[PDB]
Amino acid sequence: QPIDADVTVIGSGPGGYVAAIKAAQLGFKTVCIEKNETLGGTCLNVGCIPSKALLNNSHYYHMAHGTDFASRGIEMSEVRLNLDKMMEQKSTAVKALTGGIAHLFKQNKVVHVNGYGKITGKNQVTATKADGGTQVIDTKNILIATGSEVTPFPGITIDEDTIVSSTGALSLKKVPEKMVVIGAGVIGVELGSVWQRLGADVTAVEFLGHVGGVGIDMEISKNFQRILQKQGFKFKLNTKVTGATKKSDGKIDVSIEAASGGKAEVITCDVLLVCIGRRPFTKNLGLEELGIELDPRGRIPVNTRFQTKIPNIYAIGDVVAGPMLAHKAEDEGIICVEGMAGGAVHIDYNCVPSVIYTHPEVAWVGKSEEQLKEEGIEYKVGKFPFAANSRAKTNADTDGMVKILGQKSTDRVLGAHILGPGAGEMVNEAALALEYGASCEDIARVCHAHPTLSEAFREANLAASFGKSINF
Amino acid sequence: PIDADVTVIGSGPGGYVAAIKAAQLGFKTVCIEKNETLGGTCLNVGCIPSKALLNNSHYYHMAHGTDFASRGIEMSEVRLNLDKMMEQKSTAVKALTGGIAHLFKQNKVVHVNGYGKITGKNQVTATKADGGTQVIDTKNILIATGSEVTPFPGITIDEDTIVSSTGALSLKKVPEKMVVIGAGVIGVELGSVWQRLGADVTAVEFLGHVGGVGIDMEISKNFQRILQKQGFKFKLNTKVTGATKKSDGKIDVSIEAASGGKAEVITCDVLLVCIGRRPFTKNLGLEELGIELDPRGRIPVNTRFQTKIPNIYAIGDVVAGPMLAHKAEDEGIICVEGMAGGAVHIDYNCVPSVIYTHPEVAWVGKSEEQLKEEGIEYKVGKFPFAANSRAKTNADTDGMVKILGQKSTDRVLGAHILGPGAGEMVNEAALALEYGASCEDIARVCHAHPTLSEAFREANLAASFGKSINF
Ligand SMILES: Cc1cc2nc3c(=O)[nH]c(=O)nc-3n(C[C@H](O)[C@H](O)[C@H](O)COP(=O)(O)OP(=O)(O)OC[C@H]3O[C@@H](n4cnc5c(N)ncnc54)[C@H](O)[C@@H]3O)c2cc1C
Ligand SMILES: Cc1cc2nc3c(=O)[nH]c(=O)nc-3n(C[C@H](O)[C@H](O)[C@H](O)COP(=O)(O)OP(=O)(O)OC[C@H]3O[C@@H](n4cnc5c(N)ncnc54)[C@H](O)[C@@H]3O)c2cc1C
Ligand SMILES: NC(=O)c1ccc[n+]([C@@H]2O[C@H](COP(=O)([O-])OP(=O)(O)OC[C@H]3O[C@@H](n4cnc5c(N)ncnc54)[C@H](O)[C@@H]3O)[C@@H](O)[C@H]2O)c1
């Protein structure tokens, strides 16, 4: 009972499932293998999707329970949090989307094989089911899209109960009294803010001096931090979490100290979120046998067509270099498969936007001020605060600004950083600008609808271009 | 007795933006305003106050309705404090009006408070309230007077019970039953606001679709369908004969089919006459100055926005082109820029339109009806928000994204969005349009996951390649 295919995709995460569909639509007899009970990988099952849901609901909880709705004439008795119903909405959405992928696979002739896939030959993949079951796939090509897993903190062991990873954090049974987050990367910030909104006393202990992780613009990061602290989210930057141990009483003690020399103190909380990153997952894929050596971070090295050392074996997504993001993985899946079909394969990680779905949102694409400086690029800067943007004022949600970085002489946009409302959606316009190699003048002159948050984007470019915006 | 370079009459979107940009260019600029505040129709009785009410009413609906409960935000009783909801509105308006006072100040623009009139080809006299005057000699005169509510003969607006958009933005009590004459953008938005708050709303429209001119019909039909299931009722292809205020306070509205007959009568507590707006030019001195208006009352201008008289310009709602705030602002800037010597160029095809209901509606470019009428060979790409990850995660999935691409060049000819985030999203489409971008261009641009913008990206992929990934 072996099965034969043109393309066998290992992994059904954002990269894998999008690649499988595209390959099928390009005419390839396609097979997608998944070890988990559902398709969709990290993002859909325990990542982007469930997290954005909690983020959305908790924020609305905040507007109802807090003073915002009251200030609009929406008067409520007692605003109560039903954590179970809130988690249900989250699960309902995750269920629908997983089911959505199952149907798309069927619509596109994608054969779904359930099991742990292992490359057992240059042109063979063997998938082993939990019941010992076996299914062999002879295939012309193999696309590794195995993804990632949470990076473990040596010394602290996660039980997804009181000592959690992002997975456990997304499913807490009740709001924790006091919570501490290790690391102030985007994931830690989002989850941390979700619970903070829901009543939990939260603190994030970061080893670095800013919050938001790698690549975020420093100015944006400090202004973002300021806004988050003014909300109750507390930060202990430039501090290292050395270890943790659970008390006989139930709470957990976290030993910390200054990032360099130690002002070694201790803190206590109800729940501990170990959020120090994710790392590429290639366990028992058979790589060592094929001769495909991993790089230092454990990533599969590939060429411009996403080809591993063995040309008919490719890898994309979280297991290869570049920002570990959902849209990055899907784009690589698509262009890799188009390449297999003979077409051009292009991606510039500089135009891969980043988004923090907190409130205010944070979004950017292109370079940060720091990157331009360490690169020697000469540049100008345009700024426009949302406090001067009409849609934002009318909405009474004026937090933040748009900051545009243009090349000193070419006037070309090099980076866009948005802190405030609508950032997540707005960065996509910026992204389109960078792809076309837009100038600040070009953007400033595109007719933007009034009143819209995008007008801030327009004014910031104009400020960078002409020197002054109009409404500030 | 005072002098200047550029004298602009009107502090509306076109005017205040023009004034500011004129000053930033090195002109001695003076702005003349007849009302108690700056900002024009948009800021005082238009866009701003209505978007505020639309925003607040949607949240009242999500809270009083069932959306919030499905999210674990359980609340015992949810009551509408109409007084405070108007306050929030009023605040926003006040703040933004003062912001223009500060901006005019910051750019050293001279603010004259009075009803201006072109008294001399290089002179403008502003007669204040108390009769006191102020003359202004200038090199250029920029008319940015805007528009006013187009009345309905026979029916007289008292702004109490028979209102216009202005009275509708400040109703003292939620009406029990409300009738809207005209289903253009303004009436649909105002109708939806009161529907959400408690009123039984029915809009009577002469034409066979909602949303005004230029909207794509398929999008219009699906938009009406959604609004109807929200409680918003419509009577399309119906002419409103007349209407009378009865001694019992009630209002009787007479109606027939547009093609005549089918006489009916509708009774309501409030009547909103929303059959459009028209350019405002009363006693400006044009009637005297030699400036002949077109049949619609607009001031004829050339491509640099200047009238018959070369140093007198007109922009915004008082001139041809869509009557939108951003269209008036862009024209103001390019006109003063044109004054200072630069080139002047605007393509009203790239000017977007947004409907701020929920779902929102936004478009830029051409409708399918337009492409068909012009014999264009196009391709259609459609993507429903029901397959969009952010939409589904937010449990707000009405609508779709619709792309029209030219078959030969894959150029995006028109973009149409019915659903969440349309208003912001359309600006990514305006940018694409501006460069003559293709559906494939947009499809290969990396959009953040998960975002609504992805529906736009997928619709383009559908148009370009024939199939989307997620649908
Ligand atoms: C809490 C959280 C929030 C996040 N939020 C965002 C966000 O807002 N935006 C964003 O862009 N990214 C976000 N991410 C990251 C995003 O989820 C990942 O970048 C994305 O899933 C990477 O896609 P991928 O396809 O490469 O891998 P993954 O989706 O991690 O994995 C693909 C699949 O491979 C399967 N697999 C692995 N090995 C085998 C094998 N041998 N046989 C069979 N199947 C196998 C796995 O079980 C998995 O289902 C978030 C992550 C987390 C944890
Ligand atoms: C309820 C409503 C909702 C709307 N929503 C939107 C929307 O969402 N988006 C959008 O783009 N548009 C919207 N509009 C339309 C928008 O308001 C107009 O397109 C815009 O205001 C036109 O700008 P303008 O500067 O030409 O004129 P206006 O802003 O109408 O007027 C400019 C000013 O000129 C003054 N003036 C006139 N004559 C004289 C004189 N002789 N002397 C001194 N001063 C004078 C007026 O008093 C006025 O303040 C809406 C309109 C209404 C009524
Ligand atoms: N070697 C690797 O596997 C490697 C290297 C670099 C980046 N990455 C990955 O790149 C992605 C994005 O990077 P990121 O920086 O935003 O990751 P992230 O968003 O998960 O941030 C985690 C944060 O934890 C902080 N941290 C680690 N140990 C700490 C401690 N003991 N006390 C306090 N803070 C501590 C780090 O400084 C980092 O800012 C992540 O998935 C990350 O794992 C992996």
CB of B129 within 8 A of CB of B45? no
Residue A388 DSSP code: G
Count of domains for chain B? 3
End position of a domain, from candidates B302, B330, B347: B347
| Interface contact A23, partner B, CB < 8 A | no
On whether both A146 and A281 belong to a single domain, the answer is: yes
On whether both A24 and A144 belong to a single domain, the answer is: yes
Q: Supply the DSSP string of B181-222, one letter for each residue.
A: E--SHHHHHHHHHHHHHT-EEEEEESSSSSS-TT--HHHHHH
| Strand ranges (E), A13-58 | 30-34
Ligand 1, pocket residues at CB < 6 Å: A 10-16, 33-36, 41-43, 47-48, 51, 116-117, 145-148, 166, 187, 281, 285, 317-318, 324-327, 329; B 449
Q: Which CATH number goes with the domain that contains B140?
A: 3.50.50.60
Resolution in A: 2.5
On whether both B186 and B249 belong to a single domain, the answer is: yes
Contacts for B323 with CB less than 8 Å, ≥ 6 apart:
B147, B277, B317
Q: Comparing C-alpha atoms, which of A48, A13, A272, A280 is closest to residue A150?
A: A280
CA atoms within 13 A on the CB side of A105: 24
A274 lines ligand 3 (CB under 6 A): no
User: Chain A to chain B, count of Cβ pairs less than 8 Å apart?
Assistant: 269
Q: Which CATH number goes with the domain that contains B439?
A: 3.30.390.30
Contacts for B116 with CB less than 8 Å, ≥ 6 apart:
B9, B32, B34, B124, B125, B126, B127, B284
End position of a domain, from candidates B329, B347, B365: B347
On whether both B331 and B353 belong to a single domain, the answer is: no
Q: Strands A413-420 and A361-366: what pairing?
A: antiparallel
Strand pairing partners for A127?
Answer: A117, A135
Q: Which among A52, A70, A89 is the nearest to B72, CB-wise?
A: A89
Q: How far is CA A84 from CA A176, B65, B71, B333, in A?
A: 14, 19, 9, 54
Identify how the structure was determined. X-ray
Token digits of residue B81:
């404090």
**Residues in A touching B14 (Cβ below 8 Å):** none
On whether both A143 and A283 belong to a single domain, the answer is: yes
Token digits of residue A87:
């988690």
On whether both A141 and A6 belong to a single domain, the answer is: yes
Q: Which among B63, B72, B424 is the nearest to A86, CB-wise?
A: B72
On whether both A225 and A334 belong to a single domain, the answer is: no
Token digits of residue A153:
């903190």
On whether both A143 and A12 belong to a single domain, the answer is: yes
| Closest ligand (CA of A322) | 3
Contacts for A132 with CB less than 8 Å, ≥ 6 apart:
none
- In angstroms, the CA A110 to CA B218 distance is 33
CB of B459 within 8 A of CB of B438? no
Radius of gyration of chain A from its Cα atoms, rounded to whole angstroms: 24
Determine if residue B373 is left, alpha or beta; phi over 0 gives left, psi from -120 to 50 gives alpha, anything else beta: alpha
Contacts for B420 with CB less than 8 Å, ≥ 6 apart:
B358, B359, B360, B385, B391, B394, B396, B397, B398, B399, B452
Q: Show the domain range for A376.
A: 349-472
- In angstroms, the CA A177 to CA A201 distance is 6
On whether both B401 and B268 belong to a single domain, the answer is: no
On whether both B144 and B154 belong to a single domain, the answer is: no
CA atoms within 13 A on the CB side of A9: 38
**Do the Cβ atoms of A14 and B450 come within 8 Å?**
no
- What SS3 class is residue A346? coil
Token digits of residue B152:
């309905």
End position of a domain, from candidates A234, A261, A276: A276
Q: Comparing C-alpha atoms, which of A116, A112, A111 is closest to residue A133?
A: A116
On whether both A156 and A269 belong to a single domain, the answer is: yes
In this structure, which residue's CA is closest to atom 19 in ligand 2?
A: B324
Choice from A186, A211, A214 to test ligand 3 binding pocket (greatest atom count within 8 A of CB): A214
Choice from B16, B42, B361 to test ligand 2 binding pocket (greatest atom count within 8 A of CB): B42
| Interface contact B172, partner A, CB < 8 A | no
- In angstroms, the CA A294 to CA A315 distance is 12
Q: Give the torsion sign (CA, B275, B281, B283, B286).
A: negative
Token digits of residue A469:
């915006």
SS3 content of chain B, % helix, strand, coil (to 5): 35, 25, 40
On whether both B271 and B302 belong to a single domain, the answer is: no
Q: Is A184 a known ligand-binding residue?
A: yes
Token digits of residue A396:
């009474």
